[PDB]
Design a protein around this nucleic acid. Structure first.
Lengths: 55, 88, 90, 100, 51
RNA sequence: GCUUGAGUCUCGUAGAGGGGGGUAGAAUUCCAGGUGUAGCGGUGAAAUGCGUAGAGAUCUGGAGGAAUACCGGUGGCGAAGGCGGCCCCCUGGACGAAGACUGACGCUCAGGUGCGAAAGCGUGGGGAGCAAACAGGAUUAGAUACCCUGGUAGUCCACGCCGUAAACGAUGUCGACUUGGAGGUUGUGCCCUUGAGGCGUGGCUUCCGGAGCUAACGCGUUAAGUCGACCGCCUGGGGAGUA
């Protein structure tokens, strides 16, 4: 749920281009969605999930 | 803001009875404690207006409570004004 | 030389005529061609003498400002348009 | 009274200092009467994007509840050292063990 | 904003993208913030059909 | 004398409320180096204008300040101005669950203190891009108009002054009542999350639409309804928020 380490479950919620899917298509509760954004960008700071495949 | 153990200490030491938190006496004491502590935080940065609002509100609350107590009785007001050391 | 121009009319009043003249001055000493657009309102066709004298006065107002090249001969439409040229420096 | 979770970065070829490095932090925090809960090292892992050249740096995991000053000076130690790389610390949310 | 199509068209036929441009949001975000104006999508077209 | 008005402690919850200090990436410029010879530029109004001691193009490293892409959707916060990268420290309010506690301790506010976007002025600091005044070209009956190429103050920082806006929900505040609907969101109830269903028992917010008001448009449990306590304001347009 609120964790960030489980990159495996976190991966399917992001695009191959590196963007984040909006909650409209997914169909999830908004608070879950903001917690997900928190977790993904916290991962981004620590150099686990790339910003994009540009480099 | 005020930590729980400090609140317990002040209510035990200063209150009239056990679990007597409804008294205006403890109200005034706790408000004075909080404002005296917050003097440290407004001693710095001199711009946090959005809490200056709360400080003014609580000062006004203390003023009104003390006025009501003095209007109702004199002895308790004298005991407070001498013991706590405020207003002057 | 660019093409610059302001409206004309023989019966124009005093002050605005002088401001127009001063504007034409600024344009000439900044190198602008002289073009005239005078619109004819109604029955101005019976004042040939005074109209000619007023046009002559207008040109005389440029006695020490520029040099005259052409003079009107025929009319096509409602107006005749003449071109004036900058004066050689002395 | 205040939990903290700490993970930082370290140079890949400098894995030799890791034992004594973590020992001197754990000695400092034990002198700070901290209560450790679990330790782990995921090992070197290739990172998503190259940062100041370099690749596949080494990781670390800690866990401690302790006062504030000590985390301040250990943060400063992270600061002036140049053999160390990105350091990040979270706030409270209590303590959780395991979770490799 | 991207085009990766073939030879034949080469001219216009992106007027669908003109319709999808939504000139309101671009003309609103290019020049300053408003915070009360992009509502024009609702509350003033359907709710103001006054006869 | 008393608790229904009002205030306190127990625990918990949400949240771009504020202030101070670090950190990061993408992107613009400027610098160095590698491969190298004219473009940028409304070109349905038309081209000048400048870049030509090695460049627009493409790579490898630095300088440098500024703002924080998708999340973002009136969704959330505040007394109104207003609030958006991420880390840490000080700190403000709101609300929920049932518990005890003081016993009218309230409401409203003429003069008076406080806060109050952007332009302005004073001390300094800083200057990436930006663009009032100006510089040049095209522009037509006619441009000191926009269109294009450059370009100072100023937008940035730290202290002080300035008190105004369509500071509009064009609806001053605080209470007690009166027919309805489909939502967003927030925590607990005992179940029957076991599926996303039953208690809204609350708070803040959307959009339609009765009785009833409304000159009309329309308002329409968050009233412009029926009542109460106050305050601030109005008597035709110009002359005028002028002297």
């Amino acid at each position: 749920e609120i964790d960030y380490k489980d990159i495996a479950t976190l991966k399917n919620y992001i695009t191959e281009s590196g963007k984040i899917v909006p909650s409209r298509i997914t169909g999830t509760r908004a608070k879950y969605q903001r917690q997900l954004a928190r977790a993904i960008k916290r991962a981004r700071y620590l150099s686990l999930l790339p910003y994009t495949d540009r480099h | 803001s005020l930590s729980t153990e400090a609140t317990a200490k002040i209510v035990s030491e200063f209150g009239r009875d056990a679990n007597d938190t409804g008294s205006t006496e403890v109200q005034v004491a706790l408000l004075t404690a909080q404002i005296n502590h917050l003097q440290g935080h407004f001693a710095e940065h001199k711009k946090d207006h959005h809490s200056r609002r709360g400080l003014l509100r609580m000062v006004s609350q203390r003023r009104k409570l003390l006025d009501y107590l003095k209007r109702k009785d004199v002895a308790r007001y004298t005991q407070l004004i001498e013991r706590l050391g405020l207003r002057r | 030389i660019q093409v610059k121009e302001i409206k004309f009319r023989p019966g124009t009043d005093e002050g605005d005529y002088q401001v127009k003249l001063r504007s034409l001055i600024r344009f000439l000493e900044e190198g602008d061609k002289a073009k005239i657009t005078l619109r004819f309102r109604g029955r101005e066709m019976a004042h040939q003498q005074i109209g000619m004298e007023v046009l002559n006065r207008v040109k005389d107002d440029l006695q020490e400002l520029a040099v005259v090249e052409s003079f009107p001969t025929k009319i096509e439409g409602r107006q005749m348009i003449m071109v004036l040229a900058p004066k050689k420096k002395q | 009274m205040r939990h903290y979770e700490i993970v930082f970065m370290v140079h890949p070829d400098q894995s030799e200092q890791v034992p004594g490095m973590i020992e001197r932090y754990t000695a400092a925090i034990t002198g700070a009467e901290g209560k450790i809960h679990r330790l782990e090292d995921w090992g070197r892992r290739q990172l998503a994007y190259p940062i100041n050249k370099l690749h596949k740096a080494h990781y670390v995991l800690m866990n401690v509840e302790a006062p504030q000053e000590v985390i301040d000076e250990l943060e400063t130690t992270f600061r002036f050292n140049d053999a160390v790389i990105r350091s990040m610390v979270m706030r409270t949310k209590h303590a959780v063990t395991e979770a490799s | 904003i991207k085009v990766r199509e073939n030879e034949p068209f080469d001219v216009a036929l992106r007027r669908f993208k003109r319709s999808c441009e939504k000139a309101g949001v671009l003309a609103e975000v290019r020049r300053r913030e408003f915070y009360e104006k992009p509502t024009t999508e609702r509350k003033r077209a359907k709710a103001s059909a006054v006869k």
